[PDB]
Design a binder for this molecule. Structure first.
Ligand SMILES: *[C@@H]1O[C@H](CO)[C@@H](O[C@@H]2O[C@H](CO)[C@@H](O)[C@H](O)[C@H]2NC(C)=O)[C@H](O)[C@H]1NC(C)=O
Ligand SMILES: *[C@@H]1O[C@H](CO)[C@@H](O[C@@H]2O[C@H](CO)[C@@H](O)[C@H](O)[C@H]2NC(C)=O)[C@H](O)[C@H]1NC(C)=O
Lengths: 127, 56
């Protein structure tokens, strides 16, 4: 048999930036999604990628991870919003979760030797 | 339990018991005080952080 152990992180080695955008929750008893719920999902994914594009501005900004500037003040109201959804009192029954739409830096997922490797000025890797 | 005239800053410690643990009462678990005997010469003082301004 042959095995690779002490493999190196695929996303760091291949230098890939990864986002996550999970669908908004629905209070419908059967769990189905309307066309308007899918429209909301569409717009939220678009706005995530829009921040991905606008993060390339020259000025640093105070906090890394661009999605911060999207949530900002709203992060203080989460319980309130969640309350209105738990008791199904919230508008069209949709729930927009802050943590659902964000850029992941470190995850432990698919492994093995990555295909691409990137090197810069004497940095090394091991297999 | 007996108390001396003015009772000031009497701490209402609320503990939630969850089998494995007992944690303190959190701001999501907002609470109400009532006096079942209908007396009304009492006051309750509390701090409001900007986590309940909207819940409250
Ligand atoms: C989801 O589908 C509904 C239809 O069930 C769309 O609502 C229609 O919108 C048009 C606008 O041109 C109206 O003429 C129709 O009368 C509407 N239908 C009803 C039943 O009122 C709705 O637009 C769709 N959702 C989205 C986001 O486009
Ligand atoms: C309720 O009374 C307690 C005292 O038992 C207060 O707790 C103190 O708060 C001050 C800050 O103002 C701290 O310096 C002390 O260390 C605290 N003591 C203890 C034992 O926790 C509490 O602040 C009071 N509640 C409110 C809303 O003011």
């Amino acid at each position: 048999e042959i095995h690779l152990i002490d493999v190196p992180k695929k996303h760091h080695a291949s230098r890939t930036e990864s986002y996550v955008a999970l669908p908004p929750l629905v209070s419908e008893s059967l769990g189905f999604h309307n066309n308007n719920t899918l429209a909301v999902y569409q717009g939220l994914v678009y706005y995530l990628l829009w921040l991905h594009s606008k993060y390339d501005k020259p000025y640093a900004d105070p906090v890394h991870d661009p999605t911060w500037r999207w949530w900002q003040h709203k992060t203080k109201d989460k319980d309130y919003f969640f309350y209105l959804f738990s008791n199904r009192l919230a508008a069209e029954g949709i729930y927009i979760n802050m943590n659902a739409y964000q850029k992941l830096y470190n995850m432990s997922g698919d492994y093995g030797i990555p295909d691409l490797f990137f090197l810069d000025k004497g940095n090394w890797f091991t297999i | 339990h007996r108390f001396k005239f003015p009772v000031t800053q009497y701490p209402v410690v609320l503990e939630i018991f969850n089998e494995r643990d007992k944690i303190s009462a959190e701001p999501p678990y907002l609470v109400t005080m009532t006096e079942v005997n209908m007396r009304k010469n009492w006051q309750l003082k509390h701090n409001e952080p900007e986590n309940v301004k909207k819940m409250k």
